[PDB]
Amino acid sequence: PHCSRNPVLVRGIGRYSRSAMYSRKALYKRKYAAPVLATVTKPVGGDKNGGTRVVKLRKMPRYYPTEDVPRKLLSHGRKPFSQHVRKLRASITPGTILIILTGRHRGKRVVFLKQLSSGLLLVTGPLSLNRVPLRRTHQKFVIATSTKIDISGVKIPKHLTDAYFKKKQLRKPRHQEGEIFDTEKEKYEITEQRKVDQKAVDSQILPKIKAVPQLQGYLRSVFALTNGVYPHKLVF
Amino acid sequence: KNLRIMLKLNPYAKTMRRNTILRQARNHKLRVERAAAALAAKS
Amino acid sequence: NFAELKIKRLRKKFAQKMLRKARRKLIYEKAKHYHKEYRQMYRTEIRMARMARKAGNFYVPAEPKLAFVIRIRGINGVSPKVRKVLQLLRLRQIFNGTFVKLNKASINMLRIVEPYIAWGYPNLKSVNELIYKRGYGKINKKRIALTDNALIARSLGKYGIICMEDLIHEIYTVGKRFKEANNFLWPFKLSSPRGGMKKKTTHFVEGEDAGNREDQINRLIRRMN
Amino acid sequence: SAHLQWMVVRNCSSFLIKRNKQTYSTEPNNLKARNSFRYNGLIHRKTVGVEPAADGKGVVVVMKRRSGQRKPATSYVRTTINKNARATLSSIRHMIRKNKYHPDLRMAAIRRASAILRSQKPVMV
Amino acid sequence: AALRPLVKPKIVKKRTKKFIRHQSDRYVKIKRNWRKPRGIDNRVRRRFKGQILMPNIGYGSNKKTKHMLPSGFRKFLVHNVKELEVLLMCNKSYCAEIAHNVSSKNRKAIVERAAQLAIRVTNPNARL
Amino acid sequence: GVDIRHNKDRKVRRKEPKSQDIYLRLLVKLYRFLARRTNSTFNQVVLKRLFMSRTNRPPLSLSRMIRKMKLPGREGKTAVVVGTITDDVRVQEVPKLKVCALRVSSRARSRILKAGGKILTFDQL
RNA sequence: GGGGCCACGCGCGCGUCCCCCGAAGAGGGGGACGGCGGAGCGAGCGCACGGGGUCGGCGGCGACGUCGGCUACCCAC
RNA sequence: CGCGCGCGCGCCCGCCCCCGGAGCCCCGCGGACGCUACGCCGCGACGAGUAGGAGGGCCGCUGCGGUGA
Ligand SMILES: [Mg+2]
Ligand SMILES: [Mg+2]
Ligand SMILES: [Mg+2]
Ligand SMILES: [Mg+2]
Ligand SMILES: [Mg+2]
Ligand SMILES: [Mg+2]
Ligand SMILES: [Mg+2]
Ligand SMILES: [Mg+2]
Ligand SMILES: [Mg+2]
């Protein structure tokens, strides 16, 4: 299996024509002139009395509805979410500093590690300073500043995934009757594995931060707007 | 605007479209390096 | 005796795949010829005048063969003689348009309905943008979109016209089979000018839109389409 | 003939119902109970019908005898069958298909039967 | 719990109010029922701005959902069990509604059977 | 807007017979199918004349028929009418014919069959 | 050994013709063309996607004084 | 005119069942979830209105004949 011998020039067009690709992949010297209900097909079995038996798979229905619904027609390119192409704005690069502006950890300044395989960003506004841990965040509910540091030398573990930053609730074994149904401890409690992860990272992030002077107060402060500060004027 | 719906009708336009790109890029290359040559010859 | 029939159908599919591959090769090549045609007809004009400006002469180029026509005034307060001439040209509604060929018969008609129209001497790009984008066919006294060449050929291939480019050739070069190609087309339904007009009640010498605005018609088409 | 009977019975009939922009028919042996040529028991030389047992267990099937018409007393055959709802449908499917008795009524029969058997249980606990 | 119909497309109604007759706000001999005006000097007829609006066919409603309740079902009126059993097969498109003149002792019967056959009733608790 | 006129955009032909004679309507069911599913125009014509009214279906006389079929070439060929056949007592020599029509008078019926002729209907046609 | 050809399968011819070995023609290379022999040959996968009108094999929050309810009672603008 | 042109199976010669069901978009065995044919489906263009003319009214009021076990 050879990777494609036709390069790309623009999406949907290649750099070569028919006659040339013919010659490259050598379609010359590659000429191939190559030119009663009795049959019980799948089901089988064996048992005791009267001889043997032939058991029949995928048995027929019991109950038919009174009215059914027809099928759909076909379409081209309606992929699912696990198959899309992920994009990213240009002003976001590993080490950049970003302003959160929607949630509970609102209006804080944090640090960007990388982008996962779902379009969501991994953020550590290091817990000592901002009181903000490893989280997932959306690239569009955030601002990127023009203020940066060098992070290339750093070890992010493999096991850190969208499957790991997942919520876990909605338990079916319930009475289904009473003043209940958010009562299985009602609360969130922290594992140790998270702690271990936060420590092992900020150990090697944080020294790089202190190589910049005054970079801590910027990461303990909080952003806001005031009188005479119009945001389209101010560059970030 | 749509490549295929154009070319279902007129197939030759894929070739005319493949041309007019390679030509531009080649023409871009010459001006830049040559204008660079004189500029470096200025200073 | 079933296998004989199966083989008979599987053969007979050859009749259709081979024909289609042939025809798609046909359409390719003609367009490649037409490419060469249009260049020569462009550069040839230039070559003449340079050859003539070298001497002290001049060059009176040919006169145009076809025209594009738009209607700009409505249907309210109009004369009988003029209501007739428009509905021969198939302009029964505002901002519709049709091509037309030029001779003593046509030109006098255009002088009669001068104040209500705006016409010009178009180029090749405008013919492309009209027909592909906003260009439909008249078929069985219905209005049907040009999505594929089956429609064109089936109704119009007895003239040697089997695709879009063959029209455009037949139109741009006013050919022998112009009448049929145009009357196949429904009159183009356009949108109002993006950017605005100066004053529709006057001629295009007094700051208006009416009359002949020969080469500047194309500037306008960019904004209606 | 059938169409002749029909062209009288479109609009005027005692089994006819017309209210609320709907139109139903209540003649015996009418599957889907609508006013139609394809679905009407009194019109054809071949018809099939399905009803519930009077004792209150199983399904009653009805088929016409084709030989002596115009004597309605002994024109209809009946059977009552009471099994586990997969044997019951399969039995029906075999009657119609293997005898070619009006085979454009197959699934209509089945849906009517299943409806009955679904009802003919403790639908309430 | 509640019997689900087969499909539940969204419903859209071009007009939601009613059309009142003209000059019915002044007077009491005049009613709310639409009667078309036919005078010469009249301005609803002549369609000025800021006036009553007259019903035409463009307000007309889509046909996939016409006479369709908010619950997806269409309606049907009964008087006894006999004409109820005709709905067995259309038990997911149409619903039942019992008349006003039926007695208490018989409503119980009809409900008891509609519940078996899975035929929804749009007024199951009236007299009691 | 569009400067056109709507005074002549409905056409004033028939689409169906205005009567409730049911035997007529079954004939109409038939010839629509043949007109819809065949490559002929004979079918078209007949369909158009079964809609017509009765002053557009005047009676044909046994006399004219003989004159029009004794002409050369029209030997052995069927005669077809969309109305009534009367008798003309001013004719004595009635030869062999193969007529098709809707109605046929009684005196005319006898003479035609007594020459060895034959009478058909549109069904058997 | 320049960039470019919807060029193409090669074995001896089906041909009008021609550059040349060759006398106008046959034989040799091919070309312009028609084209089809004295050859032309045809399965299994996939991207499909700028292809005959949208799907998510993607999610979160919320509960005896709160949720929904155009239409229909009042008031304001 | 190269998505069939002679493909396959036993032993060139022969077989050449084949949908009471092939295999995926044409099956010339019969059929729509549609077939109240006074029905169902699909395309494309149009919609001002006095006097006035026509049609459809499962809009309505009182009574007669049949019919809703
Ligand atoms: Mg005016
Ligand atoms: Mg603007
Ligand atoms: Mg102005
Ligand atoms: Mg004026
Ligand atoms: Mg309303
Ligand atoms: Mg007036
Ligand atoms: Mg009018
Ligand atoms: Mg008229
Ligand atoms: Mg009107």
mmCIF file of N, CA, C and O in Angstrom, chain D residues 29 48-63 77-82 88 92 95 112-113 116-117 120:
data_model
loop_
_atom_site.group_PDB
_atom_site.id
_atom_site.type_symbol
_atom_site.label_atom_id
_atom_site.label_comp_id
_atom_site.label_asym_id
_atom_site.label_seq_id
_atom_site.Cartn_x
_atom_site.Cartn_y
_atom_site.Cartn_z
ATOM 1 N N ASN D 29 -66.718 -7.961 8.607
ATOM 2 C CA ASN D 29 -65.595 -8.344 7.768
ATOM 3 C C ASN D 29 -65.163 -7.174 6.887
ATOM 4 O O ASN D 29 -65.181 -7.237 5.659
ATOM 5 N N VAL D 48 -62.016 -12.109 3.609
ATOM 6 C CA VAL D 48 -61.534 -12.629 4.871
ATOM 7 C C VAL D 48 -61.830 -11.610 5.955
ATOM 8 O O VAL D 48 -61.833 -10.399 5.719
ATOM 9 N N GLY D 49 -62.096 -12.122 7.149
ATOM 10 C CA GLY D 49 -62.463 -11.298 8.277
ATOM 11 C C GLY D 49 -61.972 -11.935 9.552
ATOM 12 O O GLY D 49 -61.706 -13.137 9.611
ATOM 13 N N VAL D 50 -61.835 -11.100 10.572
ATOM 14 C CA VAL D 50 -61.188 -11.475 11.817
ATOM 15 C C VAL D 50 -61.934 -10.801 12.956
ATOM 16 O O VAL D 50 -62.198 -9.597 12.902
ATOM 17 N N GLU D 51 -62.267 -11.571 13.982
ATOM 18 C CA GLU D 51 -63.070 -11.087 15.095
ATOM 19 C C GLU D 51 -62.546 -11.714 16.370
ATOM 20 O O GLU D 51 -61.742 -12.652 16.328
ATOM 21 N N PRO D 52 -62.994 -11.233 17.525
ATOM 22 C CA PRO D 52 -62.634 -11.873 18.785
ATOM 23 C C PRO D 52 -63.601 -12.967 19.190
ATOM 24 O O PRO D 52 -64.796 -12.926 18.899
ATOM 25 N N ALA D 53 -63.053 -13.953 19.889
ATOM 26 C CA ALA D 53 -63.864 -15.038 20.404
ATOM 27 C C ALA D 53 -64.877 -14.515 21.413
ATOM 28 O O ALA D 53 -64.620 -13.562 22.153
ATOM 29 N N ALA D 54 -66.042 -15.156 21.438
ATOM 30 C CA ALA D 54 -67.118 -14.704 22.307
ATOM 31 C C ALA D 54 -66.889 -15.116 23.749
ATOM 32 O O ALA D 54 -67.220 -14.358 24.666
ATOM 33 N N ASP D 55 -66.329 -16.305 23.966
ATOM 34 C CA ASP D 55 -65.973 -16.719 25.316
ATOM 35 C C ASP D 55 -64.945 -15.780 25.931
ATOM 36 O O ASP D 55 -64.987 -15.526 27.140
ATOM 37 N N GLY D 56 -64.029 -15.255 25.119
ATOM 38 C CA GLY D 56 -63.079 -14.253 25.551
ATOM 39 C C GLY D 56 -61.646 -14.734 25.530
ATOM 40 O O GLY D 56 -60.810 -14.255 26.302
ATOM 41 N N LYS D 57 -61.335 -15.663 24.629
ATOM 42 C CA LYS D 57 -59.970 -16.156 24.461
ATOM 43 C C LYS D 57 -59.760 -16.585 23.022
ATOM 44 O O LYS D 57 -60.433 -17.495 22.533
ATOM 45 N N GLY D 58 -58.827 -15.938 22.361
ATOM 46 C CA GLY D 58 -58.460 -16.281 21.005
ATOM 47 C C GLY D 58 -59.136 -15.420 19.972
ATOM 48 O O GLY D 58 -59.828 -14.441 20.267
ATOM 49 N N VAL D 59 -58.909 -15.812 18.727
ATOM 50 C CA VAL D 59 -59.340 -15.072 17.555
ATOM 51 C C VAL D 59 -60.225 -15.973 16.713
ATOM 52 O O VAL D 59 -59.970 -17.176 16.588
ATOM 53 N N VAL D 60 -61.264 -15.388 16.133
ATOM 54 C CA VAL D 60 -62.146 -16.078 15.208
ATOM 55 C C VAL D 60 -61.828 -15.609 13.801
ATOM 56 O O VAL D 60 -61.771 -14.401 13.536
ATOM 57 N N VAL D 61 -61.643 -16.562 12.900
ATOM 58 C CA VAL D 61 -61.306 -16.292 11.513
ATOM 59 C C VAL D 61 -62.490 -16.690 10.658
ATOM 60 O O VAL D 61 -63.220 -17.630 10.982
ATOM 61 N N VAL D 62 -62.673 -15.976 9.553
ATOM 62 C CA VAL D 62 -63.851 -16.129 8.718
ATOM 63 C C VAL D 62 -63.439 -16.076 7.260
ATOM 64 O O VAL D 62 -62.740 -15.152 6.839
ATOM 65 N N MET D 63 -63.908 -17.044 6.485
ATOM 66 C CA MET D 63 -63.601 -17.165 5.072
ATOM 67 C C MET D 63 -64.863 -17.552 4.328
ATOM 68 O O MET D 63 -65.705 -18.277 4.863
ATOM 69 N N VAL D 77 -67.388 -19.751 6.432
ATOM 70 C CA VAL D 77 -66.713 -20.758 7.235
ATOM 71 C C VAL D 77 -66.053 -20.043 8.396
ATOM 72 O O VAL D 77 -65.598 -18.906 8.244
ATOM 73 N N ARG D 78 -66.004 -20.698 9.554
ATOM 74 C CA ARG D 78 -65.405 -20.117 10.742
ATOM 75 C C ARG D 78 -64.449 -21.080 11.411
ATOM 76 O O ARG D 78 -64.668 -22.294 11.413
ATOM 77 N N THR D 79 -63.391 -20.520 11.984
ATOM 78 C CA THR D 79 -62.509 -21.246 12.875
ATOM 79 C C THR D 79 -62.126 -20.327 14.017
ATOM 80 O O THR D 79 -62.042 -19.108 13.849
ATOM 81 N N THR D 80 -61.897 -20.924 15.178
ATOM 82 C CA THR D 80 -61.382 -20.221 16.342
ATOM 83 C C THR D 80 -60.118 -20.924 16.787
ATOM 84 O O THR D 80 -60.078 -22.156 16.864
ATOM 85 N N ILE D 81 -59.078 -20.140 17.026
ATOM 86 C CA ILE D 81 -57.751 -20.653 17.303
ATOM 87 C C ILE D 81 -57.147 -19.855 18.442
ATOM 88 O O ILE D 81 -57.290 -18.630 18.502
ATOM 89 N N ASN D 82 -56.460 -20.555 19.334
ATOM 90 C CA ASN D 82 -56.019 -19.978 20.595
ATOM 91 C C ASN D 82 -54.642 -20.549 20.907
ATOM 92 O O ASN D 82 -54.532 -21.672 21.408
ATOM 93 N N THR D 88 -50.105 -18.153 16.025
ATOM 94 C CA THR D 88 -51.385 -17.651 15.564
ATOM 95 C C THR D 88 -51.225 -16.822 14.306
ATOM 96 O O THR D 88 -52.047 -16.899 13.389
ATOM 97 N N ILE D 92 -52.251 -17.926 10.125
ATOM 98 C CA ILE D 92 -52.978 -17.046 9.225
ATOM 99 C C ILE D 92 -52.196 -16.837 7.946
ATOM 100 O O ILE D 92 -52.720 -16.983 6.839
ATOM 101 N N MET D 95 -52.576 -19.721 5.596
ATOM 102 C CA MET D 95 -53.861 -19.817 4.914
ATOM 103 C C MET D 95 -53.854 -19.040 3.620
ATOM 104 O O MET D 95 -54.082 -19.574 2.531
ATOM 105 N N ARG D 112 -54.666 -6.447 12.725
ATOM 106 C CA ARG D 112 -55.924 -6.496 13.449
ATOM 107 C C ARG D 112 -55.880 -7.570 14.517
ATOM 108 O O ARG D 112 -56.410 -7.393 15.618
ATOM 109 N N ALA D 113 -55.245 -8.690 14.208
ATOM 110 C CA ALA D 113 -55.177 -9.797 15.145
ATOM 111 C C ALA D 113 -54.361 -9.431 16.369
ATOM 112 O O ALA D 113 -54.798 -9.618 17.506
ATOM 113 N N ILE D 116 -56.028 -7.319 18.877
ATOM 114 C CA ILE D 116 -56.973 -8.052 19.705
ATOM 115 C C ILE D 116 -56.248 -8.794 20.811
ATOM 116 O O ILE D 116 -56.604 -8.691 21.989
ATOM 117 N N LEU D 117 -55.211 -9.540 20.453
ATOM 118 C CA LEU D 117 -54.509 -10.345 21.441
ATOM 119 C C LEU D 117 -53.843 -9.469 22.486
ATOM 120 O O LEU D 117 -53.760 -9.841 23.659
ATOM 121 N N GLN D 120 -56.598 -8.635 24.659
ATOM 122 C CA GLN D 120 -57.207 -9.822 25.228
ATOM 123 C C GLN D 120 -56.273 -10.497 26.217
ATOM 124 O O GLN D 120 -56.046 -11.700 26.208
#
